[PDB]
């Protein structure tokens, strides 16, 4: 028997789920970003998509280097705030290539911050990155990507209510010539959760008309399914002691039921007034309990 003391703040919540739809969106975005980078840098980059990592937010935060450009982005209409992380190496490579450099010298990063010119270069790159990501998402679910803010430290973002929240991280590796760099795209699981059934199964070559026809027929098929409806006349609170002495012939007082709740497996569906019709216990339906 395994029995160990409960320790809070321990990484005990494990939620592993393959995300095929994200697995293809990543390659589509990588292809779009590669040509965007070719268009900008006038060079030939190769982007390798890494394995999607489903990890608590503080793991993602601690694995990041300091300083690193973080780009808070809004993936409307999905409520939340995603993050696009550009490594110092990648921005160094881009600035070197733009400003008359054939990347001859090795990239040197020693905690140096980002100037206004570097920030503008990163904004120019991030415009292409966001356009590519939006186009890639457009195939499955049309989303609009808005860049709201850029930061350099990790403690300024806090896109997760708690550091133990679970986020989805995709690291890409971009190589230009001999130089290499990496950049990540992190989405909080709260944003993805309404689209989990869409992001879980691999996409199929269908149409929106076919999809809506599918659930329509399924909805119609569901309607022909019998349910069990239970009407509760009264709910009287008695102690255990009363129940054992309880014996036939006793009278347990109850209050006036103005309305009668009808529930299916616990969930209330109807409130209706009791009655007798055709020798049967009947209910006059008064109100369907809408949410």
């Amino acid at each position: 028997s395994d029995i160990r003391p409960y320790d809070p703040n321990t990484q005990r919540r494990v939620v592993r789920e393959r995300l095929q739809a994200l697995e293809i969106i990543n390659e589509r975005f990588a292809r779009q970003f590669r040509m965007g980078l070719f268009n900008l840098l006038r060079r030939s980059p190769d982007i390798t998509v890494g394995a999607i990592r489903i990890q608590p937010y503080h793991e993602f935060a601690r694995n990041l280097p300091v300083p690193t450009n973080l780009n808070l982005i809004h993936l409307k209409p999905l409520r939340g705030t995603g993050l696009v992380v550009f490594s110092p190496s990648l921005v160094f490579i881009a600035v070197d290539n733009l400003f008359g450099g054939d990347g001859r010298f090795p990239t040197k990063v020693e905690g140096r911050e980002f100037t206004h010119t570097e920030q503008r270069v990163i904004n120019r790159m991030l415009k292409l990155a966001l356009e590519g990501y939006s186009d890639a998402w457009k195939a499955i679910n049309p989303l609009e990507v808005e860049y709201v803010r850029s930061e350099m430290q990790v403690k300024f973002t806090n896109i997760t209510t708690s550091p133990n929240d679970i986020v989805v991280n995709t690291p890409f590796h971009v190589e230009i010539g001999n130089l290499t760099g990496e950049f990540n795209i992190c989405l909080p699981f709260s944003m993805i959760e309404p689209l989990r059934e869409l992001l879980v199964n691999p996409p199929l070559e269908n149409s929106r008309h076919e999809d809506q026809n599918w659930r329509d027929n399924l909805v119609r098929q569901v309607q022909h399914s019998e349910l069990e409806l239970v009407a509760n006349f009264a709910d009287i609170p008695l102690r255990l002691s009363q129940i054992l002495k309880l014996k036939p012939g006793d009278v347990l007082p109850i209050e006036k039921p103005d309305r009668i709740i009808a529930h299916v497996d616990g969930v209330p569906v109807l409130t209706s007034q009791y009655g007798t019709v055709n020798g049967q216990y009947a209910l006059r339906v008064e109100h369907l309990i809408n949410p």
């Binding site: 400003f99 008359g100 450099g101 054939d102 010298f105 100037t115 206004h116 010119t117 570097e118 503008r120």
Partner: protein, 319 residues
């Protein structure tokens, strides 16, 4: 008129056109170079009429344009002095500013620029340097750490040209920083002013302040001492002091120093030696050809140092 000017420049010749371009602004030179080789139009009558009309009006401004800056510089030099002429010329040059902030960066002090661009990416630093004036860039790299200095110099050696968009972005970034602020730090009072201030106070305070400066830095004290007594107050030295100092002044060094000196100074300094010695010195000065001021300045400095040492000892006076 630009096409006519380009045609005239083409018909003038390579040397004349090159001289005109060297005496022309960057935009004008670029436009003239582009238009002349691009499309050239020759008119039997219209070109001749335009040339005659242009020639008929070049009367008053020609004399002004012949000598404008040189005359102003000479007037500034002769008016107050070399030190004030430099300040006046600097103010006149600063009156014409630069639009793009990159060029405005070379009017800033070297340390201010070094602090401003130290944190930038090394390639951006390199791009700023080739656009910046060479003298300024050298000072900036001197103030830069040796690692950054070597890295930026290497980037300078193997520069490969900037994308126009990136250059425009850097230009507007620097413009947004240095457009609405004045960078003309007025420098009033260096060492000439310090020497002038020192020369007018009591001797005890004079020696106290010069020894304090020497304790702080000997080079500054020596520069203050040299600026204290220039090679122009020797006319106010007493005849006895001049005769006493003549015993320790080399004839060749004295002649070299007095070759470029004022005639009054030579006459005053020739009354302390013998008549034969004065005649020999005059003959040597007449026979001496022109020489570079570098050696004459050193000889005058040596003579002034000897005179100052004699005065400090107590064997010389002034009047």
């Amino acid at each position: 008129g630009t096409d006519k000017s380009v045609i005239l420049l083409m018909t003038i010749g390579e040397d004349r056109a090159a001289e005109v371009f060297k005496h022309l602004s960057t935009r004008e030179v670029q436009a003239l170079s582009t238009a002349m080789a691009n499309v050239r139009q020759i008119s039997n009558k219209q070109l001749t009429d335009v040339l005659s009309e242009f020639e008929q009006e070049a009367e008053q401004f020609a004399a002004l344009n012949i000598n404008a800056n040189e005359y102003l510089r000479s007037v500034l030099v002769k008016a107050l002095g070399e030190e004030r002429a430099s300040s006046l010329l600097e103010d006149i040059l600063e009156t014409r500013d630069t639009t793009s902030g990159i060029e405005t960066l070379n009017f800033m002090e070297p340390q201010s620029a070094a602090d401003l661009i130290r944190d930038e990416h090394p390639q951006i630093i390199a791009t700023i340097l080739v656009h910046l004036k060479r003298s300024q860039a050298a000072d900036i790299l001197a103030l830069f750490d040796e690692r950054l200095r070597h890295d930026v110099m290497l980037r300078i050696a193997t520069f490969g040209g900037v994308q126009p968009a990136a250059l425009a972005e850097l230009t507007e970034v620097l413009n947004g920083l240095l457009d609405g602020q004045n960078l003309k730090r007025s420098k009033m009072g260096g060492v000439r002013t310090a020497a002038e201030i020192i020369n007018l106070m009591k001797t005890q305070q004079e020696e106290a302040v010069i020894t304090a400066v020497r304790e702080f830095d000997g080079e500054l004290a020596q520069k203050i001492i040299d600026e204290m007594f220039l090679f122009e107050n020797l006319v106010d030295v007493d005849d006895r002091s001049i005769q006493r100092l003549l015993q320790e002044v080399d004839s060749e060094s004295l002649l070299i120093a007095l070759k470029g000196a004022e005639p009054p100074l030579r006459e005053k300094f020739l009354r302390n030696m013998s008549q034969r010695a004065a005649d020999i010195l005059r003959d040597d000065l007449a026979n001496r050809g022109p020489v570079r001021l570098s050696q004459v300045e050193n000889e005058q400095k040596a003579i002034l140092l000897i005179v100052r040492r004699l005065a400090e000892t107590g064997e010389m006076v002034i009047g």
